[PDB]
C-alpha cells in the first residue's frame, strides 16, 4: 500500500546536472526524517544526503557537499535531489528512504533508479 517511486535518472555527462525525485503513494513524507542512498560499482550502498525529523536538517556525505541539494515539497508529497557538476564517480544506483510515521522495523524504500555519468 505504500510506494514510494524514483525518476529522474539516467545518462549524463560529466559537469552536468540531474535532479532525481522521490514519489509517495499511501504515506506523507510531511516532517519525517528520509534520505537518498547510492550503491556504486563494487562498493556497498551508502548515504549521500537526508533530512532529519527533529529540526528538518539536511546533511551532506563530504564526498557531494557544495553539489548536491536535498529538498521536499510537501504540495507535491514529492522528494527531490538535485545533483548538479556530477563526476562518473557518482554513478550508481540511487534509492530514497523514508521513515515510517509510526513504529516499525524498517523504512520505506524506493525502488532505486540507474544514474550514469560519463
Ligand atoms: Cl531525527
Known amino acids: 500500500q505504500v510506494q514510494l517511486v524514483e525518476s529522474g535518472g539516467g545518462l549524463v555527462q560529466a559537469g552536468g546536472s540531474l535532479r532525481l525525485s522521490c514519489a509517495a503513494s499511501?504515506?506523507?513524507?510531511?516532517?519525517?526524517?528520509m534520505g537518498w542512498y547510492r550503491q556504486a560499482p563494487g562498493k556497498e550502498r551508502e548515504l549521500v544526503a537526508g533530512?532529519?525529523?527533529?529540526?528538518?536538517?539536511?546533511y551532506y556525505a563530504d564526498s557531494v557537499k557544495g553539489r548536491f541539494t536535498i529538498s521536499r515539497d510537501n504540495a507535491k508529497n514529492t522528494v527531490y535531489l538535485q545533483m548538479n557538476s556530477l563526476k562518473p564517480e557518482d554513478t550508481a544506483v540511487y534509492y530514497c528512504?523514508?521513515?515510517?510515521?509510526?513504529?516499525?522495523?524498517?523504512?520505506?524504500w524506493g525502488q532505486g533508479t540507474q544514474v550514469t555519468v560519463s
Open positions: 499511501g504515506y506523507i513524507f510531511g516532517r519525517n526524517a
Open positions: 533530512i532529519t525529523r527533529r529540526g528538518s536538517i539536511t
Open positions: 528512504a523514508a521513515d515510517p510515521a509510526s513504529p516499525a522495523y524498517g523504512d520505506y
